[PDB]
Design a protein around this nucleic acid. Structure first.
Lengths: 7, 117, 54, 154, 142, 109, 101
RNA sequence: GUGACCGAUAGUGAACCAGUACCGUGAGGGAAAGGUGAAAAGCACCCCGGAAGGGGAGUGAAAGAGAUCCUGAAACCGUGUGCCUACAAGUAGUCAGAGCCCGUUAACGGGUGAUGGCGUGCCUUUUGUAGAAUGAACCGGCGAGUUACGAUCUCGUGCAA
RNA sequence: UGUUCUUCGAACAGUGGUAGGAGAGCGUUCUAAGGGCUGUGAAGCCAGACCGGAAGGACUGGUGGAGCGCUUAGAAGUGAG
RNA sequence: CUCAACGAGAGACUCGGUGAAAUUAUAGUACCUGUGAAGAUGCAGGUUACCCGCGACAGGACGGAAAGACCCCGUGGAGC
């Protein structure tokens, strides 16, 4: 996936 | 019993830091870079104690080549003449001091001239 | 926007070369002194060329 | 030990998410709360040599004191009063200046109450002899009854 | 223990004529002169070499088809900054920095290399303004 | 030579050095008037230390204060008071209330 | 000046000059001689068919001593290999006089 | 009453107004923090300063001993001074090396060093790391092959079918 | 360091090294033995151009103001990047 | 937007007062082409570059922040 959704 | 061990560690650190005196910046101040610099200096000291023995020799070869080319011969012909004109084992930095004491080098050069023909 | 390496002492001192501030334009007050900065009323005597105007 | 320190079992912070170490216990051995995994533990240092070695040890140390001429034999140890001045005069009369043993077969009370204030002198019974008092004092004063006891005891 | 000169070096002035030699074979000899390889008092860290003057730089020649094939590049720090000229255009207009680029290529790289580059003097022929130094004529070894 | 030390007054040392680097080495008659006009509000504290040093020269040694000159003008650091400032999302950043030792030594020229 | 090999390395010496050579024993305080002298010098005599007769150079031994200590530390820059060793090279200091031809 | 038990990051969490301060609605979690001097004899008095804080003068064996107060290291911050630095691309060292400045546990002396040659930190994990793979801002302290009971082997001692 | 001869010892050969195996040592705390330094100055701290093959150890000068070291052994809360 | 141009206020800029944080092996920390754990500020060859700042931009430092969430393994777990 490699989704950049860092919180 | 309990062992604290407070002083021997600081003695080691100060021995390393006094061995690393004169270094740039934090390398004469902080222990953990001073120890690495001292170890690297030990490797460099061993390597350069090996390398000095041959770069001095190449400097003396250069100076003997210049002094021989003043007299009309190259370095290789001069050394071949020295091995042919008797077995003379005259070492090369004494041959380099022989041009500080000219014209003693010219007489050995003429001795090389004599039996190359 | 994050410092990769820390600044050494020498680079910090080189950057702080121009951080110093200058001496003000201070001159002798003709009434009393000492001393009085140029183009301002003297705080001691309250005079300016040359009346006591406070 | 790590279990016996007065400390909670919770973890101070969660396992992931913070940029810190894991640190599952409040007082792990790397913490300031202590600290020891092994440590000293209460134990007995007692062990027994075989009996022939014990008899050989006591006989050999007695023979080594005999060949060094440090043995003094005093028959019956006659002491009139309970004063330690008389015992000090007796030790002075036999040229004893360093530490000494006094071996008494019947364990006389006048001998026992005396010479215990002198720091280098230890009064011991005939069967109460041992390796350390013989090697420690380097001179023994032994009665004839004590010799005639320890010859058949050991 | 061996001798190592420092602030006692005597430097002479030499005149090298480039009428018939190559770019080329003389440039290595001039670089060896500037390094000090001809003197027995050579010390590699103090620049024992001496001054040299080159005259008739326009009379230099180079063999083969290098007059149209040899290309000099002077790339800037800008994109698309590659500027090029042939050896004929570099000889015809000003061959002085042709000769100095040859010497700079054959000199060592460093502070001493930039120092020994300063002793080189290349002029369009056949006069030089260094007659006050009284230079001597040097003949090439070959 | 007379010496006056401030010893833990509330001023950051880096801000005091910005005045002390230029006040150093000057005559004391040309030193108070520099401090009056800079303004750089550590300079009243440096003025108090300077007048204390001049008075110590006049009263304890009688050094004829019109001939004095500043000799040593070093700034040291005192103990730091630790304060915490609340930030966004519960960060609790640290605030250092810096403290300096101001020392002025005057002597003859 | 004369050309002396006694190391086994070749050295160039003057009259009355103190030199440092390798640790030959010499029973220090006793006169030591060098017999393998090349190129006797002075009149600039060539050397050939070496160790010629009549080339005798004598010396006076003053000290049997130690050089400055060298800490020979070598480590491979990985692999946990460390090696520390001090070195103390012995020498012989002689004073050379009466060069003979 | 005794420790081949600890000595203030140790030893009880707690040598000190400690289950205290503080955190949590609550159950609960839970600190940091010892040392003047033998005796306060704890700086009378003078000067600067609003005060704090200093400089003299006294007490004291010591005041650099003056209220977190015995000794006081390092990271860090400064002030002076000897030698080098504004044409130089450097894991910052090492070998060679002139000049300048000093004299030591007098010893082929110490400090700084223009310039040349060589030279891509330490650890971990890897076939292979200068690695643009991991860890460390720095300094100081603490921090991981122990102990109980059995078994086996080597060595030593005692007695020996 | 290993082998031979063994006439103080000599000759010859060997001595890069990870995982690992074997051997010899240096330091820290406490205890037993004697012996010995200490306010005419201990431990600790700071500096030095000293010594040893290494871990390390001494000697001077300053600070410090009361304990420490040596020996042959023995135990370990036994050495930090 | 074609296609952007002015004007007002707050921050940013200067001065006075006070004053952090993420990060950080040391660092005197250029470019091109190659080489190399195969994408170099530090390696090799060459090309450039006096020393120290201030205001801006963000191409790189495989930037920082979270022991990748995807994929696989664990004879790990949990919910259905």
């Amino acid at each position: 996936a490699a989704a950049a959704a860092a919180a | 019993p309990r062992v604290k061990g407070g002083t021997v560690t600081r003695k080691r650190r100060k021995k390393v830091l006094k061995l690393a005196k004169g270094y740039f910046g934090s390398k004469h101040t902080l222990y953990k870079v001073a120890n690495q610099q001292v170890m690297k200096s030990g490797n460099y000291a061993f390597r350069d104690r090996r390398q000095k023995k041959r770069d001095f020799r190449k400097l003396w070869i250069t100076r003997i080549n210049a002094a021989a080319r003043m007299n009309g011969l190259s370095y290789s012909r001069l050394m071949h003449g020295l091995k042919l004109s008797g077995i003379e084992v005259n070492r090369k930095m004494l041959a380099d001091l022989a041009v500080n004491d000219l014209t003693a080098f010219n007489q050995l050069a003429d001795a090389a001239k004599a039996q190359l023909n | 926007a994050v410092p990769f390496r820390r600044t050494s002492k020498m680079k910090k001192r080189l950057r702080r070369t121009h951080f110093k501030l200058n001496v003000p334009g201070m001159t002798e007050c003709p009434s009393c002194g000492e001393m009085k900065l140029s183009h301002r009323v003297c705080k001691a005597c309250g005079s300016y060329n040359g009346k006591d105007i406070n | 030990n790590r279990s016996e320190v007065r400390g909670g079992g919770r973890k101070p912070w969660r396992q992931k998410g913070t940029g810190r170490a894991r640190q599952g216990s409040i007082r792990s051995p790397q913490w300031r709360g202590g600290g020891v995994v092994f440590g000293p533990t209460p134990r007995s240092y007692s062990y027994k040599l075989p009996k022939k070695v014990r008899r050989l040890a006591i006989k050999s140390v007695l023979s080594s004191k005999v060949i060094d001429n440090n043995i003094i034999v005093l028959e019956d140890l006659t002491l009139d009063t309970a004063k330690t001045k008389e015992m000090a005069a007796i030790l002075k009369g036999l040229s004893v200046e360093k530490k000494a043993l006094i071996v008494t077969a019947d364990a006389n009370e006048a001998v026992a109450l005396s010479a215990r204030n002198i720091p280098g002198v230890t009064v011991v019974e005939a069967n109460g002899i041992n390796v350390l008092d013989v090697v420690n004092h380097e001179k023994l004063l032994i009665t004839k009854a004590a010799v005639e006891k320890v010859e058949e005891v050991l | 223990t061996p001798m190592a000169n420092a602030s006692t070096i005597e430097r002479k002035w030499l005149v090298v004529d480039a009428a018939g030699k190559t770019l080329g074979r003389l440039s290595s000899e001039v670089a060896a002169i500037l390094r000090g390889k001809h003197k027995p008092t050579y010390t590699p860290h103090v620049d024992t070499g001496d001054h040299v003057i080159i005259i008739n730089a326009e009379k230099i020649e180079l063999t083969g088809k290098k007059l149209t094939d040899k290309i000099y590049y002077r790339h800037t720090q800008h994109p698309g900054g590659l500027k090029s000229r042939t050896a004929l255009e570099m000889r015809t207009n000003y061959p002085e920095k042709m000769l100095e680029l040859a010497i700079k290529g054959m000199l060592p790289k460093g502070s001493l290399g930039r120092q020994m580059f300063k002793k080189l003097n290349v002029y369009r022929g056949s006069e030089h303004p260094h007659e006050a130094q009284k230079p001597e004529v040097y003949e090439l070894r070959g | 030579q007379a010496k006056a030390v401030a010893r833990t007054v509330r001023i950051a040392p880096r801000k005091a050095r910005l005045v002390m680097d230029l006040i150093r080495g000057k005559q004391v008659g040309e030193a108070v008037s520099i401090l009056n006009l800079t303004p750089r509000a550590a300079s009243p504290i440096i003025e108090k230390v300077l007048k204390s040093a001049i008075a110590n020269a006049e009263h304890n040694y009688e050094m004829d204060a019109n001939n004095l000159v500043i000799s040593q003008a070093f700034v040291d650091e005192g103990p730091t008071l630790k304060r915490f400032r609340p930030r966004a999302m519960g960060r609790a950043s640290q605030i250092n209330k810096r403290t300096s030792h101001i020392t002025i030594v005057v002597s003859e020229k | 000046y004369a050309i002396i090999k006694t190391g086994g390395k070749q050295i160039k010496v003057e009259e009355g000059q103190t030199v440092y050579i390798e640790k030959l024993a010499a029973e220090a305080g006793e006169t030591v001689t060098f017999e393998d002298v090349l190129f006797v010098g002075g009149d600039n005599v060539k050397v050939g068919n070496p160790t010629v007769e009549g080339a005798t150079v004598t010396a006076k031994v003053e000290k049997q001593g130690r050089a400055k200590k060298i800490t020979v530390f070598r480590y491979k820059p990985k692999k946990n290999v460390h090696k520390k060793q001090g070195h103390r090279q012995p020498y012989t200091k002689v004073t050379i006089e009466k060069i003979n031809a």
